[model samples]
Target: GSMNVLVIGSGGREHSMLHHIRKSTLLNKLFIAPGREGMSGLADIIDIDINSTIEVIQVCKKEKIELVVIGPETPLMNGLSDALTEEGILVFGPSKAAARLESSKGFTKELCMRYGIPTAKYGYFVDTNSAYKFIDKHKLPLVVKADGLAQGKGTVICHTHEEAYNAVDAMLVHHKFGEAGCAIIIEEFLEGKEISFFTLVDGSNPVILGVAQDYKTIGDNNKGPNTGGMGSYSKPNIITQEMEHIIIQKIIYPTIKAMFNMNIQFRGLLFAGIIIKKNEPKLLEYNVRFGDPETQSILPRLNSDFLKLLSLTAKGKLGNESVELSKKAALCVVVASRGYPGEYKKNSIINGIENIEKLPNVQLLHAGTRREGNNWVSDSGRVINVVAQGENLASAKHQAYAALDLLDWPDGIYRYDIGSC
Candidate 1:
C-alpha cells in the first residue's frame, strides 16, 4: 500500500524532510501542515492549526493519512502524537510524557541524575531565591535554562554574578520565557567542543542516525547571540569510532532504557546536544526532534529511504533495518536577516534560490520564507538554508558558500565559516 503521509511544522527542517520523503517508493500523497511557501512545490501544504490536535486528526482521517511526521517539539509536547496514534494513525513522534525530555530541561536533568547519565551537574529551582543561592556558591560561567520550551533562547550562559541574577530573575520572576520559564535550571557550565548526536527511536530499539556540529551564534567564530541555528556540518572527524560507541553505549542506550522503565515509549528523533571533553562525552541537552540547520546538513547525506524508515519506526517495526548515511561530509548555511537573533526587518525580497537549487549536491531549504507574487520573501529572522555535500568538509563548505553567493538577498547575512573548524 502506498502510504499517505502528513508532516507537521513550518521550518527549513520540515522542508528538508519533505525533500527526502518525496523520493520514497512507498509515498502516495504527501502533506505538510502549516508549511512554508518555499515547500509548496514539494508537498500539498495544509493550513490547519498544528496546535489543535482535533484539527490535525480530522485532516488525517479525511485524507486517510497512514503516517504523520511531526517536525517540531511543541505539538509533540502538547500530545499531538498521542492523539494521532489513538486514532489508529501511525505517528513518528514521542508521546507528551516522552516529550518532557525537550519540553522540560529539569525533567531530563532528573532523569540523567537517576540513571547516572553523564551530564553537567545541575540544580533545579522554582524560586529565584534558591537559584540565587546556588548562583552565589557557583563560580562564573554557569548556565541558566528555562525549564520549559523557549524555542532556542531559553539557555543563558552567565559570565558574571549580575548576569546570573538577572537571568534567574528574568525566568523565575520576570517570566521572560512565559510559562516555559516559570521554573529554571542552573547547571555547571561545561567546557569543550559541542556535538549534536541523533538517533531514531522506536520504543526500546534505537538506531544511531548521525552527528553534526551546528553554529548557534549568528556571527562567525562563535560570537554574538544565539539564533535557531546559523549553520551546521555533519560527520565531524572529532567524533571517532570510539566516541560514537561511547555515546551510543553510555548516553543513548541508558536514556532509552530509562524512559522505557518509566513506561514512556519515545519514538522519532532523539537529539542529544553533547559536550566532549578530553575524549569523554557528556550530555548538554536533549531535543526531541531533528535540529533545524543540522537536519539540513544531515538529511542530504542519508542513503536510506526516509519515508520508509519513518513509516517502519512509526509502526514500531524498526528492527535490523540498516539506516545508512553517507560518510562524505555535508554542510548547511543559514542565510538570515541582517539583525537576526535580535530585531530584523521582514518581507525582504529573496531571489536566485532557483539558480542555487539547480547546482549539483546543493539544496536551498526554506526556514522563514513565504512566496508573494512570484517572489519568495523573508517572514522571520532565520530565513534560508543553503546546503551542499562533498567528498570532504572543505569541499562541502566551499560549494555551500558558492551556492549561497548566487542568492540576491542583500538584506540577508550568513556566517562565513560553517564547516571551517
Candidate 2:
C-alpha cells in the first residue's frame, strides 16, 4: 500500500522536503497546504491556513492523509500536531507544549537554566522599564529577544546601550510584534561564527542531519534589518566528530531526557542555532522545526532517503538508520523584492525561472511566488531561493549565482556576498 502524505506551509523548506520525499517508493500521494507556484506540479495544493487545526484536520481526513509533516513554526505553536495526534493521525512535528522550545524564548531560557545547560546568562522581562534596568545592570553588546515567535528575526543583536533600549521599547511599549512581544528576554552576547546543527529525535533515537551557516541581513555586507534568511551553505567538514559528540552528549540527549522528565516527550526534527568560537559551541537558540535556508542548503547534500527517515522518526522506529550525506557542498541564494524587511511591492513578474530549473546542479526553490497566467510573480519579501550543489562551497556558490544571474526581475534584490566569506 502507498502512503498519503500531507505537508504544511508554503515556503522553500516545504518544497525542498517535498522534492526529496517524492523520490520514495513508499509514497503513493503527496500534498501541500497553501502551496506556492513552484511546487504546484509536484504536490496538490490545498487552500487552508497551515496553522488552523480544524481546517487542516478536516482536509487531512477528507483526503485520507496517512502522515502529516509540518514545515513552519506557526502551525506547531498553534497545536496542529496535538490536534492531529488527538485524532489518531501520525504527525512529524512536536506538540504545542514541546514546540515552546522555539515559540517562547523565555520558557526555553528557563529550561536551559534549570537543566544547567550551556547557554548565555539571560533575564526575562515584561516591560520596557525592567528591560532597561536589566540593560543598565548588564554591559554593552547584549542580545534582546521578543520571547515569543517572531519569524526567526526577533532576536536583536544590540551593540550599544541605546540600541538595546530601543529594541526593548519597540517590543514591550510600541507592540511591534503585537501580543507576541508582550514579554522580552535580555541576555549576554556570545560572539562566534554562527552555524546550525540538526538532530532528528524519534523517541530515544536521535540522528545528526548536518551543519549549515546562513546570512540574515538584507544588504550585501550583512547590513540592514534581518529578513527570514538571505542565503546559506553546508559542508561535510562543517562539524567534526568532537563537536558532534559534544552536541549529542551535552545538548540533544540531555534536553530530550529533560523533556521526558517533564512529561513532554518530544519526537521530531530539532536543531540548534549556535555560535562556535575557539572550537566550543555556545547555544544561541533552539528551533522546534527545520531552519529555513539551512534546509534549503543542507537537504541537497543528503544521500539518505529523507522520507524514510521522516517516516521512521514519526513512528518511533528510527532504530539505527544511518543518515548519509554527500561530501558535495550546497549553497542557496535568496532573491527578494526591493525594499524588503520594511516594505515592498508584490505581484511583480518573475522571469527565467523555468529556464533556470532545467539547468544541472541548480534548483529553483520558491519562497514567495504566485502563478499569473503562464508566468510567476513575487508575492513576498523573500521571493525565491536558488540552491545549487557542487564539490565545494565556492563551486556551489558560483553555480547558484550563475543561475541567479539568469533571473530577469528588475524589482528583485539580493546580496552579492552570499558565500563570499
Candidate 3:
C-alpha cells in the first residue's frame, strides 16, 4: 500500500531526493518541512523548524506520515530519528549517538584508532599550546581540522608552520569555529584524488549507493576556500571493482562492525570521504548524510526505485535489495551568491529556471531559493544546482554548462571547471 512521506530539509540534496521519491509507485502523500518555493512542485511544503523534534513529530502524526527521510546532519544530530521512531514512524537516518561520526572529528578519529581503520596520522588536542607542539613536529601542508562540524570549512590545509600555528590558535584560542573548534585534530595532509562513497545501512546490511567526486573549493581549479560543495559528478572512472572491494573491506565494513559491536544500529547514509593515492584508499572523513551536489548528480543516474530502496533500508530489510544505476554520466554545477561561504546579500531575483527545466536531461534543484510571486529569488549561499546527464562525463558537463547559461541571476557565481579532468 502507498503511504505518506515527510522529508526534512530545504537544500538541493533534499530536492534531488524528492525528485526521485516522487517517481515511486509506492508513494502516496509527499511532504517537505521548511521546503523552499522551487520544491513546492514535488511535495506539500510544511513550514516548521526541523530542529524542533516535537514540531516534526507533530507534523508526522497529523499527516499520518509513515516514513520520514532526513536530508541534513543538524536534525539527525538533534535526535529527530530517535523521536520519530519512538512514535513508530519509520525514519531514514541515524540516531544521535551514531551521528557523532560526523559531528565530532575527534570521535571518528578515535574510532579509527581503535578499529585499525586506515586513515591519516593525527593527534587530538584541546589547547592551543598542545596543538602547536604537534604542528611543529609535522612537516608543511599539515591538516588542521576542527573537532566538530564547521559546515564543511573546518578542515584547513596549512602549507607552512606559521599557517598551521595560526589555524590551531584560531580554532583553539580564538574559538573561530565557536564550540566546534574548541577541540581540534592536527593530522598529516593526504595528497591524492578524493572520492565520495555512499552506502545505505540498515544495521545488518549495507548496500552501496553510488560514487561521486565533488569540487570543494569555490574558485576554478580549487583556488578558493571550500563552501559546502561547488559542484560534483557521479561514476568517477577512478573507482573500479577491486578498489570498491578494498574500500569496503579496509574502511567501510570495519567501521560498521565497530558501531555494531557498540550496539549502535546506524540506519542511514554512511558517506565516506576517501583519498586514493597510488590506488590505495584511506579514510579522510565521514559525513553521516547524503552529500549536497553529490546527491544532485548521483540520484539522477540511479535507475532503481529510490523510495523503495530507502524504505527497505529504514525497515532493516535492505538485504539483497536490488540497486541499479543508469550508465549515463551525471554532473552538477552549483550557482551561488557572489560572496558565498562568507557573507553576502540575499533575495536577488532569479530568472529563466523554468525554461532551463524544459531542457532535456537537465534538473534545476534549489539549495537556497524561494518564490516571490512568479519570480525566484536567492535565499542563501549555494543557491541553485544545475544537473545534467549524458552518454559520458564530458557531454554531461557540456549540457550542464549550457543549461546554467540560461539563468539570469547576475549576482551569482559558479566554478567554470566542474566535471573537468
Candidate 4:
C-alpha cells in the first residue's frame, strides 16, 4: 500500500511536485490545495483556504495525510510546517526558525557572520539615515534587499547613490513591500555568473539534487527588472565540478552541520543561490523550497522516485539513499501576462497546450489558471511554464521554443533565448 501525500501551494513548483508524485509507486493518493488547471488530471485539487491554519489542520486530521509538502515561502514563514508537525503529521520543510535563512535577509546575514558562512559583506538598517551612512562606505554599485520575502522581487541592484536612496525610500518610506520592507540589508555587489544549487537536506546531511541556471531578468540580454523567473535549465555542466565541490564543502555541509548543532531538524529542498567569482562560489541567498522555473526543469530529469527520497528524509533515514537522473537535459520557459511583476489582467484565453503536450519531451505546467466556463484562463502574472526535455541543452531549447511558437495568447510573452547556451 502507498502513502497519501498532501502538497500545499498553487504555483508551478506545486504543479511539478504533483507531476512527480503521480509517477511514484509509493503514492496512494496525491492532493494539491488550490492547484492550477494543468494539475487537474494528476492530483485531487482541494479548494481550501490556504492561509487558515485551523482549516488546514482540520483537513490533515480528517484525511489522515501521511506526508505534507509545502511549496511557497509565505506559508513556511507563517509557521505552517510547525503547525502541521505539532499535530503529529509528517511535514517536509524547515521550521520557522530555520526558514529565516530565506524569509529575513538581515537574520540570514547575521547567521553568516556568526557562523563564518561565505557570503557578501552586508549591513542591516531600519532607518534611512543609517542606510545612507552605510551606503557611503560601500563602493559605487551595491545590492539593497528587503529584510523579508518579496516574492523574489525585493532585491535591487543600484549603480548610483541616487538610485540607492530612491530604492530605500521606495521600500521603507513608500511601503512598497509592506512590512516586508520594514528592515533592509545593504550588501556589497558581487560580480559573477549566478547559478542555483538545490539539495534535499535531512537536517544532518545534504544531498545534491541538481544545478540550474535561471534567467531572472525579463529582457533577453539580462536587462529589465527581475521578475519571478523567466526560464531555467538544469544539468551537471551548469556549475563546474570544482565549484560544486567547494559549495558542498564550504556552504552546504557547514550550513547543515550548523543547523544540526542548533537542534533544528529540517527537511525538504534547500536552494542555494550562488555567484561564481573567479571560480569561487559564494552564497547569494537561500530558498527553503524548490526554485520555481528551476523545478519545472529539474523534476522532469529525475529518473528516481521523488516520494521515496522525501519520505526517507522526513523519517531521518537518508544516509544510504541516492537519486538517479536521466541523461537528458530539461528546460522551462515561463509565459507571463502583460505587465507582470507589477499589474496584469486575467481570463485571457490560452491555446496550444494539448498540442504542446503531444510534442516529444514537452510538458506544460500551469502556474496560474482558472476555469472560465469550459476554457482555462490566466489568473496570475506568471501563468504557465512550458517545459521540455531532450538529449542535450540545444534539443531541450528547441523543443521548448517549438511549444512556445504554438501558443495563441496575445497577452502572454516569454523570453526567446532561454537555454540557448
Candidate 5:
C-alpha cells in the first residue's frame, strides 16, 4: 500500500521534508501548499489557501491525503492539525494546546518553572510600566523576549538598562511585533554556545533525531540581528558524549514526562534550542517542529525510512522502533536577498542551480523562488539552501561553498564562513 503525504509551508525546511519523503517507497503522492519554483518540478505544487481551515480540509479530503506534515508554526498555532485530526486525518505535529511551547513564551516559562526544567529565571509583564520596573530590578545585559511568536525575531539582547527600556517600549508600546509583543519577558542572560537538538516524540517515548548548530547572526563572526537562520551544520564535535547523556536524561526525558503528566499526547518533532554553559546543556527554548536550516542538514543524513517513522509516530507506536542515522557530516548555507532580516527586493533573477545540484555531495533546496515566465526568480528574503554531505566537516563545508560560489545572482548573497568553526 502506498501513502499520500501533504506538506504545508514552502520554505527550505518544507522543501527538505519533501525531498526526504520522496525517497520513501511508500510515498505514492506528495503535495505542497504554495510551493516554490524549484519544488514545482519535484512535487505537485498547489495553491491551497492556508489561512482557511475549511479549504485545507477540503483539499485533504479530496486528495485522500493520509499524512499531513506541518513545517511552520503559524498553521500549527492556528489549530490546523487539530482540525484535520477531527476529520480522521493523521498529522505530524503537536496539537493547539501542545503548540503553546512555541506560541507563548510566558506559558513555556511557566511550564518550565512548574516542571523543574532547567531554564533561565524569568519574569513576565503585560504592560510597559511593569516591564520597565522589572528591568530596573534585574541586572544589566538582560534578555528581553516577546511573549508571543515573533517569527524568530522577538528576542533582543540588551547590554544596558536604557537599551532594555527601549526594547520594552518598542515591543509593548510601539507594537513592533504586533499582538505578539503585547506582553514581555525579562530574563538574566546566560553565557554559552548554542545548539539545536531535535527528537521525534509520540507523546510518551522520544527518539533522538540529531543535532545542528545554527548561525543566527546576519554578518560574519556572528555580529548582526538574528534572521530565521543564516546557515547550519549537523553533528558538530562540540556536542560531547557527556553533554548528550545529560540532554537526553535531564532535558528531553523530563519534557516528555511532563507532557505525560499533563495528559497531553503530543505526536511531532520536539526541537530543543539548547545553550551549553560550563559543559552542561540548558534549555533556551522549544520549537514543536524541525528547524529550518537544521532540517536541510539533518534530513539528508537520515538512513531510515522517513515515512515509516512518521507513520509509527502517528500511530503512537514509536517506542517499538529505533531510528538509524548516517555517519556522514552535513552542512547547509542559506542564500538571502540583500538587506534581509529587515527589508529587501524580490523577484530577482536566480542562476546556477542546475550546475550546483549536479555537483558531488551537493543539493540545492529552494526557499523563496517563483516562476517568472521562462525561468525561476528569487521571491523572498531567505532565498535558497545549499546542502552538502561528506565524510568530514571540512569536505562538507568545501562542497557547500563551492556550490554557493557557482551562483551568479547579483541581488543575492550568502555567508561564506558557515561550518568553519
Candidate 6:
C-alpha cells in the first residue's frame, strides 16, 4: 500500500487512467506530467515537457516513482520507456523499436506482409514523384499516409485521384507533416466498420483489456473531416465471441509473435484499430498506446483492480489473470473548439464544470484545457471528454449529454449522435 506512480501525457485517456488507478489501495501518491486541470484531484500535475527525455527521468528519480504508465504516442515514439528502463525503472509502454508498429505505417504493413496478416494491399514510397507514379494504376479513393506520426492527421482517405495527388503534394512536397512526411504509404481502402481494441502486453503475453467504437468525424452524421475521436461507446455489438478469438489467433497473436521474433521488446498497451468487414476483422493500424475517448469509455467498464493490473504488467508479471469488465455500457462524448482538426480558438472561459461533476455516474475528462485564475480555459481543439455510464448505449449517451448540458462553453461544440449510429 505504498507505491508512487506517475502517469505521462495530458489527454482524456491519461486522465481516465489516473482516475482508474487512483482507486487502488496500493497507490500512495500519484503524479502527472503537463496534466489538465480537471484531473487535479486525481494526481499532482507536474509542470514539465513530457517529451523531454532528460526531464522525465529526472522527475521519476526525484519523485522516487515506482511505476510509470505512459498514455500518449508522443513519448512512446520518442522512446521514453526505453530511456526509463535503461535507468532500472519499471515502465509500462513499448520501446521505440517495438513502437515502430505505430510510428511507422510502412513498417507495420511490411510486418503484416511478411506474417501473412490480414490487411489492405499497400505500397510504400519515398519521393513524391514515385508515389504519384505508384497511384497511376490504382483507381480513385485510396489511403495515403505520412510514413511517420502526424498527431493523428497523417492518414488521408482520398475520394478522388485529384485528392490523392493533392494530398501527396501536401505531404511529400509541401512538408505538411514535417520530417514525419519524409516517406509515404499508399494503400487500397478497406471498407468496414472500424473499432478500437486495447490489449495489455507484458513483454510476453497480451490480455485483451476492453473494446470501444469511436467516431472521428467533425459533424453529427460523420459529415466533415476526421478529428481525434469526437465520441465513443463500449458495447458487445457486431463482434461475436468466435470472431474475437479468430482476430486474436490471426491478427493479435501473430503480430505479437512476429514482434518477438524480430527482437522488438514490447511491454505495454497495444491499441488495435480493427476494421470489420464481411464478418472478418482486418488491421487498419496499430496505436502503441491507449486511444483517447475510447479509454474514457473502456476504463469505466473495467471491474478488476486496474492499478494492480498495471503494476504487474509494468513489472513483467502479468499472466492469465481473468480481465473483467462491467456489463453496464459506457459512453464518452468530446466537446471541442468551434473549428477543430484545423485552426481554432483557445483560452475561452469554460463554465459549469462544478455543476457537471455533480451529475451521477458522469466524469469530466479534460484534454486541451488549462487553469486561468480561479476558472478553466480551453487550450486545444478537443476540449473535454464527458464520460457517463448506464444500463446500455442509449442510456449512457443520455447520461453523457445530460452532463454536457451543465457546461457553458459557447466556443465549443459536441456531437449529439454518440452511440446512435
In order of appearance, the predictions have TM-scores of 0.97, 0.97, 0.98, 0.97, 0.97, 0.97
Candidate 3, 1-421: lDDT as tens digits: 4779999999999999899999999999999999887899999999999989999999998999999999999888889999988989999999999999999887899999999999999999998777888887887788888888788887788989998888888898999889889899988989888999998888868788899988888899988777789999996454997898899899998998889889886788999999999999999999999998789889988889999888888999988785788788999999999898888778799888889989877888888988777788889898999998888999999999999889888999999999888
Choose the strongest candidate by lDDT. 3
Local accuracy by lDDT, each model? 0.88, 0.87, 0.89, 0.85, 0.86, 0.87
User: Per-residue lDDT tens digits of candidate 6, residues 278-305?
Assistant: 8889998888888888889988888899
Q: Write the per-residue lDDT of candidate 5 for residues 50-153, one digit (tens) a residue.
A: 86789889889889999988889988899998999899999999998888888888877888898888888899998878888888888878989888878778
Candidate 3 minimal-lDDT segment of 10 residues? 235-244
Clashes of each: 0, 0, 0, 0, 0, 0
The pairs that clash in candidate 3 are none
After superposing candidate 6 on the true structure, give the runs of residues whose Cα lies further than 4 Å from its correct spot. none
Give stretches of model 2 more than 4 Å off.
none
Better of 2 and 3 by lDDT: 3
**Model 2 scores what on Cα lDDT?**
0.87
Misplaced by over 4 Å in model 4 are none
Residue pairs with clashing backbones, model 5:
none
Measured on C-alpha atoms, candidate 5 has an lDDT of 0.86
Task: Point out the worst 10-residue segment of candidate 6 by lDDT.
Answer: 235-244
- For 1-421, candidate 4 gives per-residue lDDT tens digits of 3698989999888898898888888988888886766788898888898888788888787777999888888888989988988989898888988898888877767778888888998989889999999888889799889999888788889999989999899888889989999899999999888998998998887888888899887778788888888899986577676777899998888888777788765677899999988888889999998889888888888888888888887777778877777778889999998888778899899877667777766778888877798787889989888888888899899888987888888889789889875
